[PDB]
RNA sequence: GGAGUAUGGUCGCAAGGCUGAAACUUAAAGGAA
């Protein structure tokens, strides 16, 4: 109740950074200018998720629903099943827990049930290939994310299974001052309850764009059928460029629309891949808040990360103004010496962070 | 203007006008082989014709004469082509077990269908473009959902082979006509045989539905036109 | 500098980039442009073509090299 | 050193539900009975 944040912006981020710090926060004036003011249903549902993994946390909601009090407890975890509400997909809930994964008292074996994709939030292949390889660079080795049943809007009925077994004391101090050289472009193109000829026609949109590029273009066609293909039909593609040298991955994704052209969507995401790569340096714009945090909660040491100014938006600063209000860590930014590009090195002294909860 | 448009096994598209004598204008050599389909848009300025020449040609109702905008080069023996009453979707049956639904404005090949084992003899879609019905000679009706290109339910009926199916413009309730001399009435939501007609006893070749009233017009092989008024 | 323009709180992040050139985090996919604007931009890949193609003292060197990389940084 | 047995380890192999089976219970036909 001592750190106060205004507004519902980056709400699941602010619960994370209070939980790792152990500094109590109070987020007031959440959506106060609405005809239905206060929290949404899923933001309440997400607060049930933090309670299930942390014993001792106290969560208080005022009766106008706009003021949320959270004194964090320690990360216990264990194995449980969270029900995801049908407003937001399961990827709205997998993404905060990877910040909490390597530090729990026990193994995270968390079962998610609900819709498994949307326009905004991360698909399953966005996490299995975009976020988990960022995890391994910081020293989270035995980390995984299994798919049991795949869902799709509007009914979903899909299931993923987050399993994290590496329980490390801190993320290691990363030094990446080199733009990684892309070796191959991989990808996953999935579809549920619909014609299997879409997926090859999705890839034909993707291989049409990339024929001027000389790197390997391989998209694993993942055609789902049967009971483990979820209730409602739909499809999507996720494309991943990779670097053979250090394992850095860049990605972009989208799903199918109510009446979309599968030739266009296979062409669109490959454009959104190369647009993301053109703004990138050693991360993506959607992988950067996972790595900014891991330099902060890494041990008491200077890390380095070569990032680009195109990544630096209004959204990136609000990330660095949520850290300074919690961890009080200035992120020093120095220019690189390469005169062809405007890369900057993000250097962070990590706050000295441990595992409170792990037994010895 | 009470204007009438017809198609032949000759590759030609001749029209009939009721206030005048029989012929005003004839297209000749529209195709080489037999045409099999003819669909009307909401306006009427363009018709779509499907032929055994592996070609689909649009025909421009110039004011009153006909010319073509584009031709469609295909690979199969085209049987029925239908345009959406929402003027968005243009479905095409082929010789293969395939239905290709095209976008109206730029012909982008929106959709393809599989798994039917016999060629499609008539295609319907709804007033609001939600359900596709592609009845074929493989003794069944496969009701395709138009949103995502999947089916909702397949339906074995009409012992011999199913020639013509048309809809009701009010709701998802449709008819079925076939060579085994039975006309049936169905739900697009319950998917059940509501009312089953036996009356005219030879092969049912044709079917048409009143656009507001609901009387049912069927044809036989043995020369009977039956009109089914709805009580 | 960008950093002393960041860590002030009187500046809006809209103004921060306008000071640097001269959005909610809840959605995961960052803001792109339209596929109309991107497909015409990404006809050629020639802009992005630059990016393609004892145990003890060893482990003690993991500390010693980690020391003076603080020092040249500070 | 060979023979033999056991083997909660590591790696590979495999299963069942008539096929036809498209997501839908779906034809012609075949298989078994």
UniProtKB/Swiss-Prot annotation, chain A:
An annotated GO cellular component of this protein is: nucleoplasm
Main localization category? nucleus
Q: Write out the annotated subcellular location.
A: Nucleus, Nucleolus
Which Gene3D superfamilies does the annotation name? RNA 3'-terminal phosphate cyclase domain (3.65.10.20), RNA 3'-terminal phosphate cyclase, insert domain (3.30.360.20)
- Presence of keyword Acetylation: yes
The UniProt entry's GO biological process terms, in alphabetical order, are: endonucleolytic cleavage in 5'-ETS of tricistronic rRNA transcript (SSU-rRNA, 5.8S rRNA, LSU-rRNA); endonucleolytic cleavage in ITS1 to separate SSU-rRNA from 5.8S rRNA and LSU-rRNA from tricistronic rRNA transcript (SSU-rRNA, 5.8S rRNA, LSU-rRNA); endonucleolytic cleavage of tricistronic rRNA transcript (SSU-rRNA, 5.8S rRNA, LSU-rRNA); endonucleolytic cleavage to generate mature 5'-end of SSU-rRNA from (SSU-rRNA, 5.8S rRNA, LSU-rRNA); maturation of SSU-rRNA; regulation of rRNA processing; ribosomal small subunit biogenesis; rRNA processing
Q: What is this protein called?
A: rRNA processing protein RCL1
What organism is the protein native to?
A: Saccharomyces cerevisiae (strain ATCC 204508 / S288c)
Protein's gene: RCL1
From Swiss-Prot, chain B:
Q: Where in the cell is it found?
A: Nucleus, Nucleolus
Signal peptide positions (record)? none
Q: Where are the WD repeats?
A: 30-60, 115-145, 157-187, 199-229
Q: Determine the domain of life of the protein's source.
A: Eukaryota
Any further remark recorded for this protein: Present with 9620 molecules/cell in log phase SD medium.
Family of this protein: Belongs to the WD repeat WDR3/UTP12 family.
This protein's assembly is summarised as: Interacts with snoRNA U3. Interacts with MPP10. Component of the ribosomal small subunit (SSU) processome composed of at least 40 protein subunits and snoRNA U3.
Function noted in UniProt: Involved in nucleolar processing of pre-18S ribosomal RNA.
| Name of protein | U3 small nucleolar RNA-associated protein 12
Q: Which gene encodes it?
A: DIP2
**Could you say which residues of the full protein are shown?**
442 to 687 of 943
From Swiss-Prot, chain C:
Q: Which organism is it from?
A: Saccharomyces cerevisiae (strain ATCC 204508 / S288c)
- Here the disulfide bonds are none
The subcellular localization recorded is: Cytoplasm; Nucleus, Nucleolus
Which stretch of the intact protein is present? 548 to 769 of 1183
User: What biological function has been recorded for the protein in this entry?
Assistant: GTPase required for synthesis of 40S ribosomal subunits and for processing the 35S pre-rRNA at sites A0, A1, and A2. Controls access of pre-ribosomal RNA intermediates to RCL1 during ribosome biogenesis by binding of RCL1 in a GTP-dependent manner and, via its affinity to U3 snoRNA, delivering it to pre-ribosomes. GTP-binding and/or GTP hydrolysis may induce conformational rearrangements within the BMS1-RCL1 complex allowing the interaction of RCL1 with its RNA substrate. Required for RCL1 import into the nucleus.
Tell me how this protein assembles: Interacts directly with RCL1 and the U3 snoRNA to form a stable subcomplex. Component of the 90S small subunit processome also known as 90S pre-ribosome that consists of the 35S pre-rRNA, early-associating ribosomal proteins most of which are part of the small ribosomal subunit, the U3 snoRNA and associated proteins.
Protein name as annotated: Ribosome biogenesis protein BMS1
> Per the similarity annotation, which family is this?
Belongs to the TRAFAC class translation factor GTPase superfamily. Bms1-like GTPase family. BMS1 subfamily.
